[PDB]
Enzyme design. Structure first.
Site, mmCIF file in Angstrom:
data_model
loop_
_atom_site.group_PDB
_atom_site.id
_atom_site.type_symbol
_atom_site.label_atom_id
_atom_site.label_comp_id
_atom_site.label_asym_id
_atom_site.label_seq_id
_atom_site.Cartn_x
_atom_site.Cartn_y
_atom_site.Cartn_z
ATOM 1 N N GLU A 1 0.813 -1.192 0.000
ATOM 2 C CA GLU A 1 0.000 0.000 0.000
ATOM 3 C C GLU A 1 0.868 1.273 0.000
ATOM 4 O O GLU A 1 0.526 2.233 -0.681
ATOM 5 C CB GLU A 1 -0.997 0.071 1.159
ATOM 6 C CG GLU A 1 -2.020 -1.078 1.171
ATOM 7 C CD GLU A 1 -3.094 -1.038 0.125
ATOM 8 O OE1 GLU A 1 -2.940 -0.341 -0.880
ATOM 9 O OE2 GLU A 1 -4.086 -1.774 0.284
HETATM 10 N N1 LIG Z 1 -2.618 -9.727 -0.479
HETATM 11 C C1 LIG Z 1 -2.541 -8.368 -0.706
HETATM 12 N N2 LIG Z 1 -1.583 -7.815 -1.129
HETATM 13 C C2 LIG Z 1 -1.557 -6.406 -1.471
HETATM 14 N N3 LIG Z 1 -2.614 -5.642 -1.284
HETATM 15 C C3 LIG Z 1 -3.681 -6.247 -0.732
HETATM 16 N N4 LIG Z 1 -4.888 -5.702 -0.458
HETATM 17 C C4 LIG Z 1 -5.601 -6.684 0.047
HETATM 18 N N5 LIG Z 1 -4.949 -7.854 0.130
HETATM 19 C C5 LIG Z 1 -3.718 -7.625 -0.381
#
Ligand SMILES: Nc1ncnc2[nH]cnc12
Length: 261
Positions: A175
């Protein structure tokens, strides 16, 4: 496929900034960008994956495997009793699972399975972690460092321990790479734990829509406004690319041309 290492145990703001830069540059398409913001590749470009090795203060590591096209964490490995122990999410296809096996643990005689027996959606991870919202799971460098040590080389751990690690790592790696705003939340709080605010959560949940809106924008104007949250939980109606670009690190892949600009 390349490995980017982040030394959590010795982390500084500058080393995290460098980590973010390296991750974005390895994951992005070599060329694609919209409004100056790099874009991830189509799901056919090779290598399809990137590895991210996270090192704790005791020099133990966990390696995450990320899909370049959407930056999702697909699974992770750790060294356990001499063996490459691979942990794959249960929502990975048979063909991608083979790739995870072979990318995390290329030597087929030195590896050991320890499945992640649940999917990688935040709703699931939250459930496993015992929280009604990941606003309740603090993020932070010392938290990440501690959580690595609860898993790496450890014979057995609970699903709660694992899901906490995954929520922290997913947000501080994928993120933060997707959103400079999230990278900056980590930097502003670098020496301490913090709870993700409503804007962190709104960006996370709307990355696909945001990326599409930026890709489709003409002369800097979104075709349709996009309603997000500000950090104080008030609505944020985004009208222009320049309003949201500062918060963006990577765009999800969107086919077709855009103002690159
Ligand atoms: N496994 C994952 N990897 C990256 N972003 C995500 N958002 C939700 N699950 C995720």
């Amino acid at each position: 496929v390349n490995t980017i290492t982040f030394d959590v145990g010795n982390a500084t703001i500058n080393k995290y900034a460098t980590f973010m830069e390296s991750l974005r540059n390895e994951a992005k398409d070599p060329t694609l960008k919209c409004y100056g913001i790099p874009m991830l590749p189509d799901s056919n470009l090779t290598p399809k994956y990137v590895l991210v090795k996270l090192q704790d203060a005791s020099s133990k590591t966990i390696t995450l495997m990320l899909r370049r096209n959407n930056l999702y964490v697909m699974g992770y490995s750790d060294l356990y009793n001499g063996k490459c122990r691979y942990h794959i999410f249960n929502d990975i296809s048979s063909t991608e699972s083979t790739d995870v096996e072979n990318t995390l643990c290329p030597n087929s005689n030195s590896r050991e399975k320890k499945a992640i027996n649940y999917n990688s959606q935040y709703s699931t991870l939250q459930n496993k972690a015992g929280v009604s919202s990941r606003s309740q799971v603090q993020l932070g460098i010392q938290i990440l460092n501690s959580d690595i040590g609860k898993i790496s080389g450890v014979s057995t751990f609970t699903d709660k321990t694992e899901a906490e690690f995954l929520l922290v790592a997913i947000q501080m790696v994928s993120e933060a790479a997707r959103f400079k705003y999230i990278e900056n939340q980590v930097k502003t709080n670098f020496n301490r734990a913090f709870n993700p605010n409503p804007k962190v959560l709104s960006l996370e949940e709307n990355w696909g829509k945001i990326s599409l809106a930026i890709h489709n924008a003409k002369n800097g104007a979104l075709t349709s406004p996009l309603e997000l949250k500000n950090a104080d939980d008030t609505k944020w109606i985004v009208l222009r690319v320049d309003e949201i670009k500062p918060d963006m690190g990577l765009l999800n892949y969107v086919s077709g041309t855009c103002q690159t600009t």
